[PDB]
């Protein structure tokens, strides 16, 4: 595994990933609904042109987050066995320097890992499903499959990943951790 920091564009969000090699394909972040940084990161207003699917029908991000927390409390074990809300704010992907939107979603569990994930819809089917439901970008960074039909979860060759390009998955995992450590923004972890 690895832990990595994503800076708030406007605070650091630590994610745990078993696929640090896919960092150039991380197109959004997802925090557990109960994550301690959520209230900090919530924007006062929706950005202009926000996708209505992202707002939970709330007039402001704060109202939407409060409603999401209240609603998911009405779920049972049956439901818990993809929904979410945009916080109105962005983090910076440390690999490509690009802004990525921050969500909460109940598919991310508060007391596991760091309680936050980087979402890589190209290569994690859970993220693929969420991205399709919300209209988020799906980017291929591991050649081998067909991301238009499903997440590609296997081994392959790095693409669209700058200094990782051409590497195998195991080689790319080592390279990106090296880069994270040189920048002081992540670590390999068991
Ligand atoms: C299992 C396959 O995981 C994959 C597979 C492919 C890819 Cl590209 C990735 C991941 B992985 O998603 C995180 C983390 O890595 C992985 C940790 O799962 P393991 O059971 O602890 O090994 O699950 C996810 N995870 C970490 N903390 C979590 C939490 N609190 N709640 C829900 N899921 C969490 O990162 C990427 C981008 N999503």
Swiss-Prot record:
Subcellular localization(s) per the UniProt record: Cytoplasm
Top-level taxon of origin: Bacteria
Family under the similarity heading: Belongs to the class-I aminoacyl-tRNA synthetase family.
Protein name (record): Leucine--tRNA ligase
Source organism of the structure: Mycobacterium tuberculosis (strain ATCC 25618 / H37Rv)
């Amino acid at each position: 595994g690895a832990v990595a920091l994503f800076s708030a564009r406007a605070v650091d969000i630590e994610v745990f990933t078993t696929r640090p090699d896919t960092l150039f394909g991380a197109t959004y972040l997802v925090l557990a609904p109960e994550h301690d940084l959520v209230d900090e990161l919530v924007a006062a207003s929706w950005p202009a042109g926000v996708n209505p699917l992202w707002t939970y029908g709330g007039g402001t991000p704060g109202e939407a987050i409060a409603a999401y927390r209240r609603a998911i409390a009405a779920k049972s074990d049956l439901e818990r066995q993809k929904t979410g809300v945009f916080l109105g704010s962005y983090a910076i992907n440390p690999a490509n320097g690009e802004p990525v939107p921050i969500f909460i979603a109940d598919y991310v569990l508060a007391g596991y890992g760091t309680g936050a994930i980087m979402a890589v819809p190209g290569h994690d089917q859970r993220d693929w499903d969420f991205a399709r439901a919300f209209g988020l970008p799906i980017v291929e960074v591991i050649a081998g499959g067909n991301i238009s039909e499903s997440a590609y979860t296997g081994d392959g060759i790095l693409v669209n990943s700058d200094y990782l390009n051409g590497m195998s998955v195991p080689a790319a995992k080592r390279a990106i951790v090296d880069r994270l450590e040189s920048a002081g923004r992540g670590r390999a972890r068991i």
